[PDB]
């Protein structure tokens, strides 16, 4: 119950249980078990350590927690350093993709202060 | 509705039938995957800017042909939704009548 830095659930099935890693979801999580020879419905208590070490270097291929967080921070901070339109929206907290801003915009905005 | 706009529509019909469907080979034949993907293809997507911009079929608005009204058109009739009621109740569009089921 320690891969990629954390991986601590138990009593869960394996392909759902790997998805607490920041960088994996239900497709890459099936790619890990299908690429590491593990059936998808086993539990983390039911894995033996001679499988779990073969899953640690397996998930060491795709980018995980820290490298992905400083990577996405490099992307957003890069755009804000260029000062393009997208990064100009990132510097101000408004929708980047071109959503409606007259009415909703409220996930990127936050709560409503007035 | 603004004779300027009405003549602008038939200008775009004229150039849209003049250039393309004769020089649609610049994209439908050249801009394809083949053994010709060198700078002939870049010469093609380079070339379509030389053509008049008002020659593409997607600058058409497909207006009514009694009023030129831009909104509320019917491709079957060629008339806007006002004039087709005006001619439908008159008895012009053949076979057309009020529907109820």
């Amino acid at each position: 119950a320690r891969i990629a830095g954390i991986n601590i659930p138990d009593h869960k099935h394996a392909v759902i249980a790997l998805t607490s890693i920041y960088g994996v979801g239900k497709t890459r999580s099936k790619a890990i078990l299908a690429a590491a020879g593990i059936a998808e419905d086993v539990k983390i208590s039911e894995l033996s350590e001679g499988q779990i070490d073969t899953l640690r270097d397996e998930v060491a291929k795709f980018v995980v927690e820290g490298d992905l967080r400083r990577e996405i921070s490099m992307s957003i901070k890069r755009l804000m350093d260029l000062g393009c339109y997208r990064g100009l929206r990132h510097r101000r907290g408004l929708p980047v993709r071109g959503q409606r801003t007259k009415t909703n915009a409220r996930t990127r905005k936050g709560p409503r202060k007035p | 509705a603004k004779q300027s706009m009405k003549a602008r529509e038939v200008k775009r019909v004229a150039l849209a039938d003049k250039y393309f469907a004769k020089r649609a080979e610049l994209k439908a034949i050249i801009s394809d995957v083949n053994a010709a993907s060198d700078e002939d293809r870049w010469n093609a997507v380079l070339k379509l800017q030389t053509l008049p911009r008002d020659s593409s079929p997607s600058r058409q608005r497909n207006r009514c042909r009694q009023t030129g009204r831009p909104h509320g058109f019917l491709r079957k009739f060629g008339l806007s939704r006002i004039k087709v009621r005006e001619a439908a109740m008159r008895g012009e569009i053949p076979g057309l009548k009020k529907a109820s089921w």
Binding site: - | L74, K76, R85, A88, L96, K97, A99
Partner: protein, 98 residues
Amino acid sequence: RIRIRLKAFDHRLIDQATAEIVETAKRTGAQVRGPIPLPTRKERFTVLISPHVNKDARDQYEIRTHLRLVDIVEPTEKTVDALMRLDLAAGVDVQISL
């Protein structure tokens, strides 16, 4: 072998032009497979009825396309030219197939 399909807007006019061709193909030759009806196309057109606002006031319409088959089984040369020079009742459109 001749497949005569004809479509019109009025049922009481296409059933007139059909009797104007069964008496042809039975007047000369024989072996016609009946005035076969086909399903009616029902193009429906809903339009706004005011020149402005009042969206909910509409006007629903339809045209009717009635179709009939003929199916001459064995053609005679009086029959294939009997189809010619007889194409009246404008409102009915006819197609022959071989």
